[PDB]
């Protein structure tokens with residue numbers, strides 16, 4: 561049994577093992593960091609089964625749950641939020657915050673998403689690149705999703721820049737254990753205060769809704785509100801950052817499609833679709849422990865054994881997606897849903913918000929900066945360490 565997670569084959573590519581497993585051993589066992597074992601599922605159809613089977617559980621206190629890191633080990637012990645719940649508790653809590661993420665709600669947010677994007681692009685225009693390239697991540701990729709989720713949660717405008725920096729420290733590969741843990745507690749302390757505040761006087765934000773609708777009547781307590789809010793903040797912010805960066809680096813490698821996008825900005829939606837499939841920046845979230853013996857393909861997963869379903873590998877499953885290893889936004893899509901945001905009840909609560917943020921980014925960026933280009937050789941792009949989810953740390957560009 562090989563050690564999992566695997567390292568990416570190279571900068572922007574998925575681990576090399578997936579293609580091989582998809583071909584001759586779709587369901588196999590891997591060894592985790594503590595030496596324990598877990599089953600690895602690689603085919604699209606099987607990944608979908610793992611995500612919807614009622615015989616599988618996301619409860620981390622269960623025997624055999626696949627924690628991938630020592631941190632995961634300790635993290636599993638605390639009080640769980642909906643991300644780690646099974647029905648009926650799952651939707652009972654998730655339904656408490658889902659209203660803000662529906663298509664209708666997201667469509668109502670467009671003017672705000674657009675405004676936030678325009679504001680950050682304008683500040684880049686005013687700053688310029690006369691003396692050299694600027695960092696697309698720091699100046700755009702990072703703040704766009706950060707400012708948006710913080711605002712939605714309820715964070716006042718004046719505190720966005722500081723809190724955006726602190727949250728980044730949580731996942732900066734440069735950060736140290738001490739520092740990461742500190743920023744982590746700092747954010748929780750801040751959110752605990754925000755909650756008391758909206759408890760006194762609610763405004764139009766997610767925390768206020770939780771305070772009026774769930775805390776006051778006693779359905780959940782303040783600490784729970786703090787935890788749910790923290791989950792919404794950290795679940796996909798770093799992912800949004802990498803997706804925006806990978807999107808710009810990808811277009812830099814595909815001049816013909818980039819020309820299509822500049823010619824017609826309305827192709828942003830279809831560009832985002834191929835992007836979320838091609839670059840699955842969140843690949844280790846579909847994990848389960850079997851509640852009873854369950855068969856997957858030609859393998860029997862025993863009750864209490866762990867399972868990791870790779871949506872990244874699934875999105876490269878040739879049997880589903882023709883020519884899966886080539887970025888082509890003009891591809892003929894099959895009836896099977898790409899799995900960038902998961903599948904089943906747990907499917908990313910912010911899928912609609914995420915796609916709307918990405919779409920706004922790619923239908924605007926090149927309209928604002930038609931001559932926007934990566935300033936470093938694409939081969940020298942600074943991607944995240946190969947042992948982590950695909951992403952980009954910094955990205956010099958000129959315009």
Ligand code: HEM
Nearest residue numbers: 643792795796800842845900901902903906907908910914
């Ligand atoms: C393009 C960026 C994003 C990508 C690719 C992404 C992907 C995912 C994936 C693959 C899952 C696992 C789904 C499953 O269990 O089947 C997930 C879960 C989740 N995401 Fe995201 N996500 C993104 C942005 C966000 C954002 C911006 C938020 C917050 C506002 C967010 C909040 C969540 C939450 C709360 C869950 C857990 C849902 C549950 O278990 O019920 N995600 N996301």
